[PDB]
Amino acid sequence: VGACVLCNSQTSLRCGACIRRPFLCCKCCYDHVISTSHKLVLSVNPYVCNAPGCDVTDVTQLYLGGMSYYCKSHKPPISFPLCANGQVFGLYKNTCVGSDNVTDFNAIATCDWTNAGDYILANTCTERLKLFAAETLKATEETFKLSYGIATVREVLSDRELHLSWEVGKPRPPLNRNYVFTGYRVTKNSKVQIGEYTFEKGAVVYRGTTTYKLNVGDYFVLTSHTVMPLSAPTLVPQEHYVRITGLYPTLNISDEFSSNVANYQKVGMQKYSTLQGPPGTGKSHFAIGLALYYPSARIVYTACSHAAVDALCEKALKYLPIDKCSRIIPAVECFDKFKVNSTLEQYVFCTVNALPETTADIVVFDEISMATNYDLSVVNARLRAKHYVYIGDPAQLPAPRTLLTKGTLEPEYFNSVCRLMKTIGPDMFLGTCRRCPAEIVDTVSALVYDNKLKAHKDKSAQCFKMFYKGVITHDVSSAINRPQIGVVREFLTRNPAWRKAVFISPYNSQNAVASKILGLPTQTVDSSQGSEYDYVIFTQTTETAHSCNVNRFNVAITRAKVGILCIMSDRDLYDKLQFTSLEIP
Ligand SMILES: CC(=O)Nc1ccc(F)c(C(=O)O)c1
Ligand SMILES: [Zn+2]
Numbered sequence: 001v002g003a004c005v006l007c008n009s010q011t012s013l014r015c016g017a018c019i020r021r022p023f024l025c026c027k028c029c030y031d032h033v034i035s036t037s038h039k040l041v042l043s044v045n046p047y048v049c050n051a052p053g054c055d056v057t058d059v060t061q062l063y064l065g066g067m068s069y070y071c072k073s074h075k076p077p078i079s080f081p082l083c084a085n086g087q088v089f090g091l092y093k094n095t096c097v098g099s100d101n102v103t104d105f106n107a108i109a110t111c112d113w114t115n116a117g118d119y120i121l122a123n124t125c126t127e128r129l130k131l132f133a134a135e136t137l138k139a140t141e142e143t144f145k146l147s148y149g150i151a152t153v154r155e156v157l158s159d160r161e162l163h164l165s166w167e168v169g170k171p172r173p174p175l176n177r178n179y180v181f182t183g184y185r186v187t188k189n190s191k192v193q194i195g196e197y198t199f200e201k202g203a204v205v206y207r208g209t210t211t212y213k214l215n216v217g218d219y220f221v222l223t224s225h226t227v228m229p230l231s232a233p234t235l236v237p238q239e240h241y242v243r244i245t246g247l248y249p250t251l252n253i254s255d256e257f258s259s260n261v262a263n264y265q266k267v268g269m270q271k272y273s274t275l276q277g278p279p280g281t282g283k284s285h286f287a288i289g290l291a292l293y294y295p296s297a298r299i300v301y302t303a304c305s306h307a308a309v310d311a312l313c314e315k316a317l318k319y320l321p322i323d324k325c326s327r328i329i330p331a332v333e334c335f336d337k338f339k340v341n342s343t344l345e346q347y348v349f350c351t352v353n354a355l356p357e358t359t360a361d362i363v364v365f366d367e368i369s370m371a372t373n374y375d376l377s378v379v380n381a382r383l384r385a386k387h388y389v390y391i392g393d394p395a396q397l398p399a400p401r402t403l404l405t406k407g408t409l410e411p412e413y414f415n416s417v418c419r420l421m422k423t424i425g426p427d428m429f430l431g432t433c434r435r436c437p438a439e440i441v442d443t444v445s446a447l448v449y450d451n452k453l454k455a456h457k458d459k460s461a462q463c464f465k466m467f468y469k470g471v472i473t474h475d476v477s478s479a480i481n482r483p484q485i486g487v488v489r490e491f492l493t494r495n496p497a498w499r500k501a502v503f504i505s506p507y508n509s510q511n512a513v514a515s516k517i518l519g520l521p522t523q524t525v526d527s528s529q530g531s532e533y534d535y536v537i538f539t540q541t542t543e544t545a546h547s548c549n550v551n552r553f554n555v556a557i558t559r560a561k562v563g564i565l566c567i568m569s570d571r572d573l574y575d576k577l578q579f580t581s582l583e584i585p
């Protein structure tokens, strides 16, 4: 028994064909089964023919006879159809409201999540269907991971370099960072974990979490997880106040946090607030300063990634008493300078998935662009807070959507928070970039920030762009542009100072070839998010949707403190770069 995900009406029915088995009311179950392929219905029991070796499961071909379910062919003379009167038969028949249209629910229930349109719907439907969609998508993502073949160590060539044998009649996952494996040793009658791993083309390179002397018949699978049901909204109902509520402003604050005093007061005067922090504008400084402005406030700092949490930890360690901080860790190497798993500590740093059920004066949820609606709901379920602050940048990268192949995901569809920030605007904006030369700031100010982002630094004059398509080769899941690397090679010979540069591209394969040819450290745009370097060399590699995506371009060029070389495939983004043009040697 439970609540219908369309009406809320009490019900004894779940759709057995839906992967999350959502409770549907007599009417909503009916409208769902007759307008889709979903015909298996579950109650206290499953609506299936309780006849011996009858296969009939379709509820519309089934009848209650006695206290058992039968099809047409096996039913007793005294029976009634389970599925008639615009209703499916279960408890609480007399309390059932229905809906005008069941169309959004059916689309969520039946879509394969390969098209942007599925995520648009998941983010504009009713709040109750946002949760259904978020569960459904996530269960679908975890199942897609099982669809991948096992990789088995066929030969150890060296340290860090292997030969894999792949399970026949199942696809191989992409060999990039967005696919994290887990090793396993063959035991008497079982298997035991041996740390997570990632692979890249060579033979394959592997950069595992822990170190080992792994040997033949050792195997690797992407760890999939049980997805729990969601209950809490993606956002609590908003409230505006006429005074700061449940918080006590400090009387003395350092001129280090004085720029955020108005913002800090705004946090205290509504239930939740959104802070758009562009690259290098002081998001973690904001987040910790909030503790100093409200010194008695119990604050839970959360984010999706251990790295995002640890960065809040590093910033805390420098401003907050260490004995008032705790890092929550469940039973990967993260931040180890705070007492571990002390929930009742004033300052709690903890990833979304490991959050305890607790209260707080303020919840700071950082790197919000990377959050899914699933994450947003979990936080609301675990943390009852007086104030929620959502910090991030809808102009930066979202969580990879492993299943999305067709269409682009616009930032207003990344999650409910980014939706608000893109529709009504952010509550608070960090308007001054301290990281980047003015050429980069000016470029992205106009590209994605509506000319509201201001440079601290002057022009560097070390910001260059070259228009060069070169030559694109494709391997199994990546792109390579050797001539764009050649242009970088010739540039470096005439500009040896740039040998301190980081190499960035939209493709792991481009990066692997650049690494060998240039010896620069490499990053994907996606892995560079949150990092900064003095000098950046960027090869666009292709002009795909992937490589021209404005959020990815934005992250790519805002990594640079001093200089950047952009080797561009795309005339559009080339013409938007406010950088000195260089001809081709
Ligand atoms: C058949 C197969 O995929 N194997 C396998 C082994 C260990 C695991 F832990 C997982 C897993 O986490 O899904 C999967
Ligand atoms: Zn269904």
Ligand SMILES: [Zn+2]
Pocket (backbone or CB within 6 Å): 004, 005, 006, 007, 008, 009, 024, 025, 026, 027, 028, 029, 097, 098, 099
């Ligand atoms: Zn209903």
Ligand SMILES: [Zn+2]
Pocket (backbone or CB within 6 Å): 049, 050, 051, 054, 055, 056, 070, 071, 072, 073, 074, 075
């Ligand atoms: Zn039957």
